[PDB]
Design a protein around this ligand. Structure first.
Ligand code: CA
Length: 164
């Protein structure tokens, strides 16, 4: 059920614009847990807990990449400890490793949360920096998927996805 790069690129744009086709996309500003921020329209809350966390975007993504056949478990650091199916490949991030658009970036070291941070490679970039689309880098779980330029700090693994 592999997706085309064009379908992937279009999915990544819809996330960032808050118009993604998902049943987990927040349509109007919402809150149910006062410990977090009011979730804006565009935010992805896949489990319905702790608002728009980092992993929520990835479980919605993996869900779409596989036509709702693979649901993710655990947190960000748990994602390299399970399988998404055929076509998906886990790569270690080393200084020469540059990812591709649509790939999943996993942060399990540095001063990151012990349960990790996660996001989608929006632009592969180069050896020094790349662009990520992620949720909950602010720790407040309210913003929709936002682009950030990352410098491979704390980034330990990439997950390659199947492309047509
Ligand atoms: Ca959630």
């Amino acid at each position: 059920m592999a997706k085309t790069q064009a379908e992937i690129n279009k999915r990544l744009d819809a996330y960032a614009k808050g118009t993604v086709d998902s049943p987990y996309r927040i349509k109007k500003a919402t809150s149910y847990d006062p410990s977090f921020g009011v979730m804006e329209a565009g935010a992805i809350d896949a489990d319905g807990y702790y608002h728009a966390q980092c992993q929520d975007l990835i479980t919605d993504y993996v869900l779409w990449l596989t036509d709702n056949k693979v649901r993710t478990w655990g947190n960000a650091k748990d994602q390299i400890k399970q399988s998404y199916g055929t076509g998906f490949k886990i790569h270690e991030n080393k200084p020469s490793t540059v990812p591709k658009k649509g790939w999943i970036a996993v942060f399990t070291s540095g001063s990151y949360q012990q349960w990790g941070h996660i996001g989608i490679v929006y632009d592969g970039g180069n050896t020094s920096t790349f662009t990520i689309l992620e949720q909950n880098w602010n720790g407040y779980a309210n913003k929709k998927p936002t682009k950030r330029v990352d410098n491979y700090y704390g980034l330990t693994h990439f997950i390659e996805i199947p492309v047509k």
